[PDB]
T-cell receptor, first 202, second 244 residues
């Protein structure tokens, strides 16, 4: 494509730094931009990067190397709100406004440090049908990877971070469910390397 | 900040070979109007722009099947006809002031799903799973889980309502749905969400929790001849009460 972005995705610890890159072959590109798209929203311009050198706006610094048409974005002290899809976009010079050419984007995920981990797998029963349940793997730290199911009849979500704002408490969780006759929470996350001390209530 | 670009409808399903019109309300005093197409929730492509009553630029992707206009006082519109499976995408409208250097302001997008046949369209079933006594005892917190299952296409919005008002704190919803039968090209989907509250809040029989799933389905104009209820745009919910 005309604009090539890297990396494809990036996980960044809260408070950590991130660098995104954008290269292009088309020397007619004159006006470069960084756009951000939060889930379910339209893209929103973060900042233009039209001039050779650094452009600092708070925690964000865009940089353009006009000679090589290298564009970058550096994020300091990364925040949860920074998790989003980041696009490089460019257009040519013309008296008349032009359509933007976009890179494929980098999905940036800023993950929390779990100060007080308490990894556990709980069984939760359907409020209308107590015979039906899901398994909730929760409260693990950032070092735990939740692997996808290797069993087509077992469904396992990716991890999700929730934020109990008033308590300044964040926690990771993933959910697993199945109608398999022998499914049990004790075995739901067998395809993942989970903490040896994970709590499994009787 | 300031006025936002608006788009109608947020979601649309259409039968292959028909006509669809997507509507955009640009920032009031902007001069340039654009359409873009986003594929698979990532790749973004320019289609066309419009200035002083006429199309200006258009990409190789702006087909003869496409038309745009903006009658005075009316919406800026993109019309597609005849639709094809490949036209399935999220279409974003944008607007800007004068200049190739001008910031382009984007709308929220319209997700257009073109289907070979509408018989595959299904609304979600929804269930809420109550917090575990073990979690309450262990952490003094209480996690509810909502599961939306069996829907197609992937046209849902999930929200949590506590005592009749929507909540965002303590919520996390999967950014992507799972395919229930990943081998099938028309597989139905499942989506989960969590809402976590203090044990003290859950351990109260007067506190009410509802998971709401807005489904965007068939239109009044869409034909339906099957026995099951026409799978129209609708809300499906599940609920739980706290327990002392």
């Amino acid at each position: 494509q005309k604009v090539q972005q890297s990396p494809e995705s990036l996980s960044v610890p809260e408070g950590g730094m991130a660098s995104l890159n954008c290269t292009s072959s088309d020397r007619n590109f004159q006006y470069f931009w960084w756009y951000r798209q939060h889930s379910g929203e339209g893209p929103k311009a973060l900042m233009s990067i039209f001039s050779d050198g650094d452009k600092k706006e708070g925690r964000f610094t865009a940089h353009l190397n006009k000679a090589s048409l290298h564009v970058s974005l550096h994020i300091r002290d990364s925040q949860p709100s920074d998790s989003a899809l980041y696009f490089c976009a460019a257009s040519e010079q013309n008296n008349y406004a032009q359509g933007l050419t976009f890179g494929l984007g980098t999905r940036v995920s800023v993950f929390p440090y779990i100060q007080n981990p308490d990894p556990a797998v709980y069984q939760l029963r359907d409020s209308k049908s107590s015979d039906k349940s899901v398994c909730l793997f929760t409260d693990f730290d950032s070092q735990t990877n939740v692997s996808q199911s290797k069993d087509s009849d077992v469904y396992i979500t990716d991890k999700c971070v929730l934020d109990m704002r008033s308590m300044d408490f964040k926690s990771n969780s993933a959910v697993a469910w199945s109608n398999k006759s022998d499914f049990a929470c004790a075995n739901a996350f067998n395809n993942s390397i989970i903490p040896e001390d994970t709590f499994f209530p009787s | 900040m300031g006025p936002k670009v608006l788009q109608i409808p947020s979601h649309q399903i259409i039968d292959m070979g028909q006509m669809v019109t997507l509507n955009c309300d640009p920032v009031s005093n902007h001069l340039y109007f654009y359409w873009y197409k986003q594929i698979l929730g990532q790749q973004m492509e320019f289609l066309v722009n419009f200035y002083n009553g006429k199309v200006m630029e258009k990409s190789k992707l702006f087909k003869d099947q496409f038309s745009v206009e903006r009658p005075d006082g009316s919406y800026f519109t993109l019309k597609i006809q005849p639709t094809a499976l490949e036209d399935s995408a999220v279409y974003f409208c944008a607007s800007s002031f004068w200049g190739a250097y001008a910031e382009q302001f984007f709308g929220p997008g319209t997700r257009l799903t073109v289907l070979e046949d509408l018989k595959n369209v299904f609304p979600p079933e929804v269930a809420v799973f109550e917090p575990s006594e073990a979690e309450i005892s262990h952490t003094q917190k209480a996690t509810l889980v909502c599961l939306a299952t069996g829907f197609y296409p992937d046209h849902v919005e999930l929200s949590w309502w506590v005592n009749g008002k929507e909540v965002h704190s303590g919520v996390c919803t999967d950014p992507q749905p799972l395919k229930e039968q990943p081998a099938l090209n028309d597989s139905r989907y499942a989506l989960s969400s969590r809402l976590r509250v203090s044990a003290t809040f859950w351990q109260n029989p007067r506190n009410h929790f509802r998971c709401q799933v807005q489904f965007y389905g068939l239109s009044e104009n869409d034909e339906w001849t099957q026995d099951r209820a026409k799978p129209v745009t609708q809300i499906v919910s599940a609920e739980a009460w706290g327990r002392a």
